[PDB]
Assembly symmetry: C5
Homo-oligomer: 311 residues x 5
């Protein structure tokens, strides 16, 4: 088999569509997601044209090996898609209608800068390589691009599944390549982060600040060091659900900043004890009373600055 011959000099247009059946395993660390979908393909092959009166059939069903089929591939997949041909139908004018159901593990970078209040645009790149006989170009039929209503991605809200209608045509290894960008827009369900991570982390930090209403150095050391220990258990838990980033994240910035608050609280507790031992308690009292206001105020202002820089 060889590609359909051009009537003039035009490229062969292969109309595409992806219909999502299942979306699962969005792996934040691996920056992958698994997909199960329908891939629809359509092109004109005049050599397959027939007369409906003479043949007695209005449509002709072929096996993939019997006819020419464009070699359509995905760019950003781990391995080639697991595909099963559902139907191949040829109309009298030779219009081929191809339908396959496939499953694939897709590589798609994630921007964690605004985590856990982030939105992502997952990509599925469709590609076709031109042949020596003729150039093959891809097109999107938007009416054949969609998703099942039941498509759910645990911990995410699915906004839209669309395609950038204009393909990216370029040369690769002395042959033209036609690339389509299918985009799955998702937004993170941040709800659970508030009672499970944000508030417990704030509670232990506020507990360390009770040392500003205590003159007992031994109890203060216990308060600040134990909550810092209680905080270490929380930081590690964050940096095992996310991959190693070259940039600063919203949550990473807050987590780092909270260490400074523990560090300055230890300095305050040390300074307070040192002055009282040095028979300067009136002074230690001024630093401790100022700390009661300074620590929550600086914490609030630093968080407003951070939220502003990130959002």
């Amino acid at each position: 088999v060889s590609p359909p011959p051009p009537i003039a000099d035009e490229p062969l247009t292969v109309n595409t569509g992806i219909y999502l059946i299942e979306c699962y395993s969005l792996d934040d660390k691996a920056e992958t997601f698994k997909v199960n979908a329908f891939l629809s393909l359509s092109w004109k092959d005049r050599r397959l044209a027939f007369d409906p009166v003479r043949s007695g059939v209005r449509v002709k069903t072929y096996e993939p090996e019997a006819i020419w089929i464009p070699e359509i591939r995905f760019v950003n997949v781990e391995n080639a898609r697991d595909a099963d041909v559902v139907d191949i139908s040829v109309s009298p004018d030779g219009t081929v209608q191809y339908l396959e159901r496939f499953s694939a593990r897709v590589l798609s970078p994630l921007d964690f800068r605004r985590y856990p209040f982030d939105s992502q645009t997952l990509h599925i790149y469709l590609i076709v390589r031109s042949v020596d006989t003729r150039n093959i170009v891809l097109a999107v039929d938007l009416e054949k691009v969609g998703k099942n209503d039941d498509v759910f991605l645990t911990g995410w809200d699915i906004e839209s599944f669309t395609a950038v209608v204009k393909p990216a045509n370029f040369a690769l290894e002395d042959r033209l390549e036609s690339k389509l960008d299918y985009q799955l827009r998702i937004s993170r369900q941040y709800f659970s982060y508030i009672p499970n991570i944000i508030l417990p982390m704030l509670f232990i930090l506020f507990i360390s600040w009770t040392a500003f209403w205590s003159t007992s150095y031994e109890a203060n050391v216990t308060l600040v060091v134990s909550t810092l220990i209680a905080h270490i258990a929380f930081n590690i838990l964050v940096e095992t659900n996310l991959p190693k980033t070259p940039y600063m994240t919203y949550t990473g910035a807050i987590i780092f900043m909270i260490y400074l608050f523990y560090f300055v609280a230890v300095i305050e507790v040390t300074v307070q004890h040192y002055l009282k031992v040095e028979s300067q308690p009136a002074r230690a009292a001024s630093i401790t009373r100022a700390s009661r206001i300074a620590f929550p105020v600086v914490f609030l202002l630093a968080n407003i600055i951070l939220a502003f820089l990130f959002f």
Copy 2:
């Protein structure tokens, strides 16, 4: 091969049945379960009809490639099912009886709102796409729907395995689609959660309340902060076996609430110490004595409110 021709204009009815052989790996985090079952299919193909007197056989056995077989698929599967044809039998009137044994990893959402006292309805969606020649519709043969008595799902009680007899007929990519819903009802075995998670978590909380029978600030700080540390090691264990939900769960609500009790206990311990340093112990004594009753009472009432809202 082509589909059986209609006598009038009627759709081809494909009778289905699923008999569960094995149920395993209910993954709460992934919201998947693995299944090993028999899939039975039945339809009339008049082109395969025969005379029993002339043929000398009452039933004819065919290989899948020899005859037309409907392309039946599962909607909510990770990859296409691993299937092995067991038998194909044709009766004299042309009624085909197809039997295959398959294994599949099924995507089925779980509602954790009442965890660990939750019940679930797992779904297995059977689907068939109509062909150009004729429309294919699915039906349930209730006599061929069941499960092996030995079918066990570790940590769960299997209630029933039934099918919604009326299919969901709809258009998908300019063709008719007939969908059946097979439902596996299960209820969680909550027993082990009581001695392993609930009671140990309550023990450490009650230990923090012993600070209400102590005037020693340094020992009180040690009691409340250390048990809060012990509590942290328990929340992490629970959350890592469940996915991220946009709603509040029963266990998550209790776990969050217990933090407030640790936080208020620290305030009480701080207030008590502050008043005694300020030479107001009669007052500190009133707050501490009230706390002895308030903390268990508010804990009991808040749990009654939570149990009411969730059940």
Copy 3:
């Protein structure tokens, strides 16, 4: 190909044997184990009978596709076995000798009630479904059931590999099914549990009891709360390599009970401090002296009761 015809009306007997080559990956959490073995099959097919003088051969070697072979399946496997046919030999009287080497992941429930002093009976269920032409029944040739001497299952002692000679014949979807039970008896090597889990867990508990020889409330709080923290680090470890059981395990019972001992020790430490603050030390001293005997005695008796209930 069709099944061998019956001389009278008798069912076709398929003699079976399983010879274990490798046993690996006994997964306690998943309740699975992997197996690599030989599966031998034997049956009489008179249509394959030949004269040795005329044919010039004493044995005939066939390809699986050339002759009729019974569809033998395993009941309790995750997916269908990975099998490779080794040999098919036909004797002059039509006796077929089939041999395949296979590998499979087997689902077999484990009873953890006596863990880590437990024994298990792993099962491999062989099954055959009858055909319309005739009924197929399975048989065990005990001389063809065995295991390689080098077969090792890490952390377990392999006792025996036998088969329940009488098959379980039953009707399933209007056809006879013949099921054989192959049993692999194993006993857990409990040795390492003594120095690695049991004794370290007992050491920290006995360390908490040193608080009964101390009047220092602050040191006592540190002793009991820190060892309870040390006990938490050991419980989590056990409840990860074990599934969520609807019943109570031997180790689970001991682990739960040890919490009560920590809880009562905290009450004692609190009661002791409260009485001394109330200028009643003679009384606190009586409770503390009684606790020195009561705690180890109640611990010993409760363990004797538990060992009796479980063994």
Copy 4:
């Protein structure tokens, strides 16, 4: 099919090229990385030469089975590459242009000596074994060696992808072997290690040094022992993202050294208490004041020595 015959006695030159499409899963522990790329092959087969005037075609497209293709393998792969032939083009002189898209898991040792400020040279070894008819030699077509601009390896900067143009020709199992070395140079994005590991680890260490401004033995013991506990919860995190190295790593050296600082701090805290109990506080004061300068100074100088030895 047989290899192309030599015109004189020359070896057959197979021109190669690798174009990277995807780079993912650089597993530090396993010392592997996954690759998805184009493999281009080119050689002259005179038996396939044709006249463009007579044939009416300027290029001829063949199926892999129709013509002779060199058996090209990768040396350092876990299993054989998953390959799909994209195109086979023959020019009139018989120059074959072969193109396949493949995916493979590559074994490439990593040098962690300078971690997390390390750079690596990943290798992909191409190999061909000579046949009895003639010797096959590999060559690099630099114009067909490259990478997609979007090629990203999470946590790494991709510097270059080049090939050592001269093959390593050698005898292996009584036949000639021609080996090419494709090199992917990468440098680690160390940025995130500073706020997530380096600074938190330094904060807890500096917190232990506050004991040099305290005379309270009980608070000092709490400061140094608790931060050492906090440090233990950091060493474990690093040594589980790397394999077992026979040499010393930069990070491993720092982590080990920090233990000595905790150990000497405990000695100082013990010596200080011992002298004060022995009524020698003037002396304990001299050691404590010296420690305030000695500990940060020795820490800085030891880190300068380490940085010098490693970089």
Copy 5:
């Protein structure tokens, strides 16, 4: 195809060789290792004899399907090897030279008794089953047994790769089997265990011994209990990289022994406090001074005894 006929009654000798290309993933817990190697086979098949003068050719090249090839298998593999035939060369006398490149996951038990100063003998068992026509026996061609110089097994030193030249011939399921033992001798690179596990574990133990230079019960309780807590984080980290054994390991013995030292240190700290409260400090002082010598001395002697028993 059928096996080569015997000239007299002798068994067919199949000469074997394994050449290691890659060694990776030595999994201590699973007791497996992955291998990528060349498997060479050689046997005489007189039916393939030819005259070099008449045929012109000195060697004949065949496709695997064209000639008879012995069914060679590996005993201790998880699944059947992934094999690709490289070459099949037939010499004038009928001597066949077969070469394949394979990859396999090998099951090989590991003796952890001397861990981390252990050496292992990994096994690769080659096997052939005799046929009805004649008996097949295996032999080792030592000239075809080896390994690539670049073969590296991370964390191990590769000593030798040899074969036990004499096969183990035995009857299995009424046929002869010929088994060869290929041995890969390796020794563990223990270096990193010293700064990463051994010394940090010793540091925390020595820190607990500072309690013998302190009269402060509350600081002593903090010293011994906190380092015991710091020790638990080091036993779990070790016993998760190794499987459960029925015997005792070197590292396991040391780890167990260190618990006794923590336990006796708590007794000493308790006895010291008890005597001082009982107005017997002269006696408490004698026990504490003796402990300063006894604890390091008994630790050294117990380690000498352990090293002697294990090495």
